[PDB]
Design a protein around this nucleic acid. Structure first.
Ligand code: NA
Ligand code: NA
Ligand code: NA
Ligand SMILES: [Zn+2]
Lengths: 243, 147, 936
RNA sequence: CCCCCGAAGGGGGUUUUUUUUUUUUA
């Protein structure tokens, strides 16, 4: 036990209840490895996301005549935590659930129907982890998919919100994720509509809505950030390509 | 099924002398139930998009349809799915909206509350049926001790 | 490297190395820097603009005085910045109402204090929390402000960095407040600064001497006999891993402050610790590590009465010595002894005492060393330095104990507070409540705001279907209307807060409907609120002879929750359907609304019951309740109950008495149904929440506590008691009767109960079911439900009963085992302390009456020593110690027969040999001289 | 149905450890 939230309204890392961690993103970081790519840092979370495709299906199975196939591979490296994990995570049910979640998230956002008989492989490497990793994965995927030139309806911004007693804390780190229940949100664009809503630990019903309220807002900010990068990276690489 | 089973289940009484334990058939000592702390119940909402995807992503007047406990025919045609687990302590045990059709947050909240309304009935039903089972067992024993 | 962010924000990477036992793990965290940290001064103009609201949308209060205490040059307009050490040493001075009015507490200091001492951290946080006009303490997050954050240099210990951070804090403060001229004084004792390019740095004593009221508080600061020095940590842990040493808490003898004992797991009896050296500066309640002494120094349990006022190798053989220790512990008079070698934990709360006239000198105007005799007679006298000796001579004071070096024969301490002249009502009362750590301060406004805004104007809704009342309260629809019930309450004459009320009516079944209705306090107190917090901290209402310390604010207790007559009141009601044999055929638990038809006194109710001219239906119901209670009590007697009502005594001279509660059938009437209620509620809430049910158990005692008493019995009275079962002890107690003295039996029951174990509150998950048993009541399960106004246990049980019936979802705080563990330990401690306080107050006042008024009372010798006897005056239920000096002239000639339990002496007033045995009926009288109970 | 021819044929749907019991109670 320790002051997760001081009477002064500060946290252990020195943030307030409604402030995001440091969020920085980079696009087209692996031009020789994938069609789209993104390197992303959220707090201490460091993630490489690679989008390969749309491309010819490896098997002449897994081929859909009406739409593209979307696969997601999440690699949580053994050195992502402070203590190295002697076990791989690749076939853990947690990781499979995360993968299927991301797939079913971007099946409804990515216009797969305009890429029939193709496969879109998403390859993710979590280099460093510090809580709220799901939203980070979401953001990385969005960035990398947009970098690939693959059509989609909107951004999807991922964020996490913890619930300490009565007060909700925005964008929780590892220490906050422990000794507290957290809600992960996948928000579509600037809308109030949720692509993802994940609650894995017990939360008082009557206080859930409030937790969403800030969450959405936070996600919006995240969108504004990702956007802000893309435009710049666009503005830079559309002016230099000229003459 | 899992909850009702866990609450219905009884492990054989045992006692312990250091290194060794002593396990009993029913005749030796009566069995004792497990420690149930709360009764989590899941409710699954299915989401259908009546209009086009464009209306869902960038359209007002949300026409997204939600139903409860979809059949197979309904489950095969749905565009989204949410599973909310609650107990009679008004606790959100868990919530899973693993992608699918984007839904407005308020609608999801309403879903959670209606789900609570359902898990009340289901929980009371489970408890009732349990107690009736135990009572019938006891009365059977009473019918067995004297012909 | 650090990165700047969107809104006056920043981030760096705090990197360090955690060393969990046997390992190394490097830890990396992100440390955010800010530009909106407020100085919280009323004089600052800039900070109130850059400040932002919290999660509640709240702008932190600027509380530091615009005009602080001003001193002599080069100090004007000063604030105080503390250091960790200064806080640790002078925490009790930081709480002193007449100094340190404006103090800044740096974050890093808060953290350090927290790391080295959590209670002191809690007291400091309390200071920062309850800041007002009288005292102002703030917390400044110097670590999160870029203006003050210093980063650690290589090859530098944490201490240098911490103190440099405090230094930078002081510097930024001086630079920030100087436009107003507020200076800051860094008070520290650690030689911090070698002249660099500054800040006022004064030690504690220096800052004290710069104060106007220095002489008042100068002595409120810590400063060939040789004790054996404590072992080292490696030595004691090595000794514990080898099973050589044993850890545990030491309890000092009740009448000998130099004899103690330690409870040990495999040992049948607690191992004795005798003598100053063997005790080794340990205190009562301290957590110690002990080592077994050779059989050469094993000792028989001392039969001496000693006060601080009246007191001037091979390992294998060590564990086999433990074996011999056990096997001799079972069967030898001379019990195995031990010595303490290390103090693991130390109580060291504030102690109430009085200066010893011997050590003072009225003539000496200079500072001197005096001795203070503590109220707790299990503790040594403490040495204090002061110049106010002649003023504190006959005044009850509070002191703090600083340390006890091996060179000093006594512990070193310092003065804290004067409570008033001895034998003053206020002084003795406050001293009494302080000695048992009873909270007696008035409720804060944050607590009073948790009260219903209606106030006394709160009404239970006439019709429950009212759309308005239901608009304000949805759960009201489940509330049952029992206002048709003829419900009455029976209580002592001085009663103001009514917790219970009863009713009874006949059923067509031939059965009986019996309703026990309890004050619905849950409806007014909610988890998380300040009211519930203060109500939780105060485990129960403490009852003194003259005053009552409430748990909850009066408005709830005196009015809103109390089951007053003639008015509608909310209640939690347990309704029963009983056989005529008072066997339970049905039971229900419902939140209800009632209206008491009458609030009887015990003798009023008894009179009305025995009165044959009154045959109103209410009276009939009361008689019914009576006989039903009789049947219940018979069933419990056959069940093997050991209930014993102790004399309840209260006084009320009311100006410028000792009223005694009488024994009536109505007492039993109320008691039996209260018991029934508590039982039923216990079962229900345990069935509801089998893990965190708020229960109360009574563990069975070992045969030891009892066969010392038994030894006395069949040595003198030729009688014995069976300890095999509860019913065995019960009827073997029924056997114990003296022909010429009818009262003796009850006395035996009293001492018997004193041999028994203490009952305790607990959550059900902590124990197996057969441990739920209440050995005293002879039942398998029990709790407290019937008195929520005056106990918090009843509150928890009420909430859980509300959860059991589906009325309202139980709070999380009562569903989590850890929080409930804290709660149980707290309410146990508070209950016990309340009991002790009550008994102490009764003893004091009764003593005062017997002293002022020359009075003879009957008594029974219940313990015999070679230098004193302890007798019990039964009508007050009060025990007292008579010393041999006082009892007899020529004590050296007196003889002590340990086997016969006999003290032979010659009374002072005129001589003739007098033998005094244990259990002897004597005549006691009280006269107080110094250098006091007496024998007639 | 797109693809040539000319005015119908041929080819194609993609097999973390921030460091003395009990009861009512002024
Ligand atoms: Na978004
Ligand atoms: Na925000
Ligand atoms: Na009050
Ligand atoms: Zn300022």
């Amino acid at each position: 036990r320790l002051e997760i939230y001081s009477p002064e309204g500060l946290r252990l890392d020195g943030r307030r209840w409604n402030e995001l961690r440091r969020f920085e993103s980079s696009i087209n970081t692996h031009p020789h490895a994938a069609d789209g790519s993104s390197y992303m840092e959220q707090g201490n979370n460091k993630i490489i996301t690679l989008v390969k495709g749309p491309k010819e299906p490896r098997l002449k199975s897994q081929m859909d005549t009406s739409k593209a196939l979307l696969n997601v591979s999440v690699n949580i490296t053994k050195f992502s935590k402070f203590e190295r994990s002697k076990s791989s995570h690749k076939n853990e049910r947690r990781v499979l659930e995360i993968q299927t979640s991301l797939v079913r998230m971007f099946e409804k956002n990515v216009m797969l129907n305009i890429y029939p008989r193709t496969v879109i492989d998403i390859e993710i490497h979590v280099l460093e982890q510090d809580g709220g990793i799901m939203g980070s994965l979401i953001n990385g995927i969005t960035l990398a998919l947009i970098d690939a030139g693959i059509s989609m309806f909107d951004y999807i911004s991922g964020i996490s919100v913890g619930l300490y007693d009565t007060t909700p804390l925005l964008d929780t780190n590892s220490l906050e994720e422990n000794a507290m229940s957290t809600v992960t949100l996948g928000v579509v664009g600037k809308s109030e509509k949720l692509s993802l809503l994940l609650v894995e630990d017990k939360i008082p019903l009557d206080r859930l809505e409030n937790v969403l309220a800030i969450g959405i807002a936070g996600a919006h900010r995240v969108r504004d950030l990702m956007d802000e990068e893309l435009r710049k990276h666009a503005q830079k690489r559309v002016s230099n390509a000229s003459a | 099924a899992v909850m009702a089973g866990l609450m219905h289940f009884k492990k054989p009484d045992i006692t312990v002398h250091g290194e060794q334990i002593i396990v009993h058939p029913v005749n030796e000592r009566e069995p004792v139930p497990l420690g149930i702390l709360h009764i989590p119940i899941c409710v699954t909402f299915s989401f259908f998009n009546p209009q086009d995807t464009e209306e869902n992503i960038k359209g007002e007047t949300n026409s997204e349809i939600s139903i409860i406990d979809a059949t197979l025919k309904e489950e095969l045609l749905r565009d989204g799915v949410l599973t909310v687990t609650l107990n009679k302590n008004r606790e959100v045990v868990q919530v899973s909206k693993a992608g699918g059709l984007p839904m407005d947050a308020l609608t999801l909240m309403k879903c959670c509350h209606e789900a609570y309304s359902i898990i009340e009935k289901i929980t009371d039903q489970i408890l009732q049926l349990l107690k009736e089972d135990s009572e019938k067992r006891n009365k059977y024993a009473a019918m067995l001790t004297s012909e | 490297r650090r990165k700047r962010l969107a809104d006056g924000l920043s981030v760096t990477q705090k990197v360090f190395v955690r060393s969990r036992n046997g390992g190394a793990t490097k830890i990396v965290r992100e440390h955010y820097l800010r530009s909106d940290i407020p100085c919280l001064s009323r004089s600052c103009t800039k900070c109130p603009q850059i400040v932002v609201p919290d999660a509640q949308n709240e702008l932190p209060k600027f509380i530091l005085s615009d005009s602080p205490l001003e001193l002599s040059a080069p100090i004007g307009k000063h604030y105080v910045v503390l250091d960790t050490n200064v806080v640790l040493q002078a925490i009790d001075l930081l709480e002193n109402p007449n100094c340190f009015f404006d103090v800044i507490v740096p974050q890093i200091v808060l953290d350090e204090v927290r790391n080295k001492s959590y209670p002191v951290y809690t007291r400091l946080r309390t200071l920062c929390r309850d800041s007002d006009d009288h005292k102002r303490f703030i917390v400044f997050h110097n670590e999160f402000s870029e203006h003050t954050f210093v980063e650690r240099l290589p090859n530098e210990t944490i201490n240098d960095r911490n103190n440099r951070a405090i230094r930078k804090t002081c510097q930024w403060y001086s630079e920030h407040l100087k436009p107003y001229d507020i200076n800051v004084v860094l008070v520290t004792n650690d030689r911090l600064n070698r002249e660099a390019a500054n800040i006022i740095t004064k030690s504690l004593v220096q800052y004290i001497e710069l104060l106007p009221n220095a002489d008042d508080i100068r002595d409120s600061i810590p400063q060939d006999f040789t004790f054996p020095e404590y072992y080292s940590t490696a030595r004691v842990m090595g000794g514990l891993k080898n099973g050589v040493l044993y850890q545990g808490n030491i309890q000092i003898s009740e009448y000998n402050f130099l004899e103690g004992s330690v409870s040990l797991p495999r040992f049948s009896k607690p191992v004795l610790i005798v003598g100053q050296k063997n005790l080794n500066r340990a205190f009562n309640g301290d957590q110690v590590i002990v080592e077994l002494l050779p059989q050469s120094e094993w000792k028989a349990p001392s039969s001496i009465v000693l006060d601080s006022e009246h007191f001037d190798i091979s390992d294998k053989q060590r564990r086999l010595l433990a074996k011999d220790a056990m096997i001799a512990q079972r069967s030898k008079k001379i019990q195995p002894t031990a010595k303490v070698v290390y103090i693991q934990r130390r109580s060291w709360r504030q102690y109430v005492g009085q200066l010893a006239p011997s050590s003072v000198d009225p003539q000496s105007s200079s500072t001197q060393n005096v001795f203070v005799i503590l109220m707790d007679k299990c503790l040594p006298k403490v040495r204090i330095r002061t110049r106010r000796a002649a003023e504190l001579l006959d005044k009850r004071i509070v002191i703090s104990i600083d340390s006890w070096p091996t060179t000093h024969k006594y512990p070193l301490g310092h003065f804290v507070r004067d409570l008033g002249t001895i034998e003053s009502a206020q002084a003795e009362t406050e001293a009494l409540l302080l000695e048992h750590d009873v909270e007696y301060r008035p409720f804060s406004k944050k607590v009073l705001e948790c009260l219903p805004a209606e106030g006394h104007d709160w009404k239970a809704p006439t019709k429950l279907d009212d759309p308005e009342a239901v608009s304000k309260d949805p759960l009201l629809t489940k509330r049952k209307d029992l206002r048709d019930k003829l419900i009455c309450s029976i209580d002592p004459p001085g009663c103001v807060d009514i917790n219970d009320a009863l009713h009874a009516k006949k059923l067509p079944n031939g059965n009986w409907e019996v309703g026990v209705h309890i004050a619905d306090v849950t409806h007014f107190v909610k988890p998380g609120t300040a009211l519930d917090a203060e109500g939780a901290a105060r485990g129960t209402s403490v009852y003194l002879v003259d005053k009552r310390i409430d748990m909850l604010p009066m408005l709830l207790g005196t009015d809103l929750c109390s089951l007053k007559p003639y008015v509608d009141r909310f209640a939690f009601s347990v309704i029963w359907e009983l056989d005529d044999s008072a066997n339970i055929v049905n039971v229900n638990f419902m939140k209800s609304v009632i209206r008491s038809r009458e609030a009887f006194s015990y003798e009023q109710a008894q009179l009305r019951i025995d009165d044959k001219t009154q045959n109103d239906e209410l009276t009939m119901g009361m008689r019914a309740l009576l006989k039903l209670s009789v049947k219940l009590k018979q069933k419990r007697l056959e069940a093997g109950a050991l209930n014993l009502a102790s004399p309840e005594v209260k006084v009320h001279m009311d100006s410028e008495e000792v009223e005694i509660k009488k024994l009536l059938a109505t007492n039993s009437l109320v008691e039996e149904f209260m018991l029934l209620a508590n039982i039923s509620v216990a079962r229900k809430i345990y069935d509801a929440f089998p893990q965190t049910a708020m229960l109360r158990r009574h563990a069975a005692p070992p045969s030891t506590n009892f066969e010392i008493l038994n030894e006395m019995l069949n040595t003198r009275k030729n009688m014995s008691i069976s300890l095999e079962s509860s019913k065995a002890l019960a009827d073997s107690l029924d056997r114990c009767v003296d022909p010429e003295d009818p009262y003796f039996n009850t006395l035996v029951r009293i001492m018997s109960t004193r041999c028994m174990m203490a009952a305790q509150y607990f959550y059900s998950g902590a124990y197996s079911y057969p441990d739920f048993r209440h050995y005293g009541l002879a039942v398998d399960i029990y709790t407290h439900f019937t008195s929520p106004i005056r106990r918090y246990c009843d509150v928890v049980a009420h909430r859980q009963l509300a959860g059991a019936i589906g009325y309202e979802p139980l709070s999380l705080t009562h569903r989590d085992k850890n929080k409930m563990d804290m709660i149980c330990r707290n309410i146990n401690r508070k209950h016990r302390n309340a009991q002790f306080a009550g008994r102490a107050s009764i003893e004091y006042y009764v003593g005062q009456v017997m002293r002022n008024n020359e009075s003879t009372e009957t008594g029974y010798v219940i313990k015999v020593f070679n230098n004193g006897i302890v007798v019990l005056v039964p009508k007050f239920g009060v025990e007292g110690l008579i010393r041999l000096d006082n009892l007899t002239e020529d004590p050296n000639s007196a003889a002590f027969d340990e086997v016969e339990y006999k003290l032979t002496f010659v009374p002072t007033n005129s001589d003739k040999p007098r033998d005094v045995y244990v259990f002897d009926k004597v005549e006691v009288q009280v006269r107080s001289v110094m250098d006091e109970l007496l024998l007639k």
